[PDB]
């Protein structure tokens, strides 16, 4: 077989990527 | 939910080109783009 | 309930597409974002208008210079789209927003409004880009 | 195109000698002394390096991206 799980590309953020603060700058 | 990803011939950027759509790179607008490789099992013997 | 409220919440990952899609002042205006202030405290601010900053900042592979006219009840100022958190509406932040809206005199948006607003997002996601939006996009 | 991994005729691995070959030529070894110094004795191995045209260096001029 040849298949792919998940099927949900929009918002799999997997938290995140270090959200920058407003009052940090 | 597979949007049919294409690769811009100039930019090499990936492009989502669903049906009833003009072929243009949304980066350049370039009109040539190539399908990405398959996802099936590509196995060779090395014969 | 902070659960229904998360249906009208725009995570940073998804808006990357809508950074250039038109009708922007009509879909996002009425949703709630989790903007960051700063230490891990957050406030639920209201997407009021679509403003533009003179600061062009790269938001991953895409890049943006636009601002967001957010306001938490009475405290309003300029905001950039990088500080918004993908975190959902917690309970303590939900009650803090409720107290910021009851303290300001603003009416709480009726649940039916949220129910009719969340569908705007899914209908905008599935919009066929058949018109000349790609050309203005590339420009 | 790229260097063959084995000398077609006999079997000696010649696919690890091309960059060495060229480096020895850049030391200005004469063209057969490069082969004598790599260790290719049989003319069947020597014609692997002498004859090889390394076109992959031209194919790599073309960009997929950047
Ligand atoms: Zn242009
Ligand atoms: Zn040989």
Nearest-CA residue of chain D relative to B12?
Answer: D65
Give the residue numbers spanning the domain of B19: 4-47
> How far does residue D8's CA lie from ligand 2's centre (Å)?
7
Tell me the pairing of strands C75-77 and C63-72: antiparallel
Q: Which ligand is nearest to the CA of D41?
A: 2
The Cα D6–Cα D29 span in angstroms is 23
Residue D66's SS3 state is coil
At least 3 CB pairs under 8 A between chains D and B: yes
Q: Which whole-number Å values give the CA distances from C91 to B5, C43, D27, in the listed order?
A: 40, 12, 74
DSSP H or E stretch at residue A12 = none
Strand-pair partners of C95 = none
Question: What CATH code is carried by the domain that includes residue B36?
Answer: 2.20.28.30
The Cα D21–Cα D38 span in angstroms is 7
Q: Order of strands across the sheet with B5-8?
A: B14-16, B5-8, B33-35
CB D25 within 8 A of CB D34: yes
CB C89 within 8 A of CB C6: yes
> How far does residue C132's CA lie from ligand 1's centre (Å)?
15
Class of domain D1-66: mainly alpha
CB C71 within 8 A of CB C125: no
Nearest-CA residue of chain C relative to B21?
Answer: C130
CB atoms within 10 A of CB C15: 19
> How far does residue D44's CA lie from ligand 2's centre (Å)?
4
DSSP H or E stretch at residue C82 = none
- Report the alpha-carbon angle C78-C82-C83, nearest 5: 70
Structure tokens belonging to residue C56 = 């062009």
CB D10 within 8 A of CB D41: no
> How far does residue C69's CA lie from ligand 2's centre (Å)?
75
Q: What is the DSSP string of B2-22?
A: ---EEEETTT--EEE--TT--
Q: For CA atoms C111, C118, C106, C81, give the dihedral sign.
A: positive
* Burial per residue of C85-116, b for 16 or more beta-carbon CB atoms within 10 angstroms, e otherwise: bbbebeeebbebbeebbeeeeeeeeeeeebee
CB atoms within 10 A of CB B37: 8
DSSP H or E stretch at residue C119 = helix C111-125
The answer to whether the Cβ–Cβ distance between C138 and B22 falls below 8 Å is: no
Residues of chain C contacting A21 with CB distance shorter than 8 Å: 36-39, 83
The Cα B42–Cα C129 span in angstroms is 35
Q: Which whole-number Å values give the CA distances from D58 to C78, D2, D17, D48, D61, in the listed order?
A: 53, 10, 19, 19, 5
Q: Which ligand is nearest to the CA of B29?
A: 1
Please give the torsion angle defined by the CA atoms of residues C2, C109, C10 and B16, in that order, rounded to the nearest 10 degrees.
130
The Cα C64–Cα C16 span in angstroms is 9
Q: What is the DSSP string of D1-60?
A: -PPPSB-SSS--B-TTSHHHHHHHHHTT--HHHHHHHHT--SHHHHHHHHH---THHHHT
Nearest-CA residue of chain C relative to A14?
Answer: C86
DSSP H or E stretch at residue C52 = strand C49-58
The Cα C50–Cα C124 span in angstroms is 17
Of C130, C135, C137, the CB nearest to B20: C130
Strand-pair partners of C49 = C69
Structure tokens belonging to residue C83 = 């500080």
Q: Can you give the residue ranges of every domain in chain D?
A: 1-66
Helices (H) and strands (E) in chain A, counts: 0, 0
Those residues with Cβ within 8 angstroms of residue C30's Cβ, 6 or more apart along the chain or in another chain: C8, C47, C109, C113, C117
Method in brief: cryo-EM
Return phi, psi of residue D62, to 5°. -75, 140
Domain count, chain B: 1
- C13: buried, middle or exposed (CB in 10 Å: 19+, 13-18, 0-12)? middle
Structure tokens belonging to residue C119 = 């569908």
DSSP H or E stretch at residue C64 = strand C63-72
The Cα C6–Cα C25 span in angstroms is 20
């Amino acid at each position: 077989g040849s298949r792919r799980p998940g099927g949900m590309t929009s918002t799999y953020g997997r938290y995140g990527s270090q959200t920058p603060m407003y009052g940090s700058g | 939910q597979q949007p049919m990803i294409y690769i811009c011939g100039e930019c090499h950027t990936e492009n989502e080109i669903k049906s009833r759509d003009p072929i243009r790179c949304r980066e350049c607008g370039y009109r040539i783009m190539y399908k990405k490789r398959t996802k099936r099992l590509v196995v060779f013997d090395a014969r | 309930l902070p659960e229904e409220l998360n249906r009208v919440r725009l995570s940073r990952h998804k808006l990357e597409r809508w950074c250039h899609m038109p009708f922007f002042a009509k879909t996002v205006t009425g949703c709630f974002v989790r903007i960051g202030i700063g230490k891990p405290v957050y406030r639920v601010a209201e997407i009021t208008g679509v403003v533009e900053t003179a600061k062009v900042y790269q938001l991953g592979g895409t890049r943006t210079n636009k601002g967001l006219q957010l306001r938490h009840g009475n405290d309003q100022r300029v905001f950039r789209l990088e500080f918004v958190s993908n975190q959902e509406f917690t309970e303590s932040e939900f009650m803090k927003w409720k107290e910021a809206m009851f303290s300001a005199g603003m009416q709480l948006p009726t649940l039916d409004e949220i129910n009719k607003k969340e569908l705007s997002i899914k209908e905008a996601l599935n919009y066929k880009f058949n018109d000349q939006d790609i050309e203005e996009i590339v420009k | 195109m790229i260097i063959p991994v084995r000398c077609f005729t006999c079997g000696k691995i010649v696919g690890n000698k091309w960059e060495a070959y060229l480096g020895l030529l850049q030391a200005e070894y004469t063209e057969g002394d490069a082969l004598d110094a790599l260790g290719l004795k049989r003319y069947c191995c020597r014609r692997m390096l002498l004859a090889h045209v390394d076109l992959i260096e031209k194919l790599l001029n073309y960009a997929p991206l950047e």
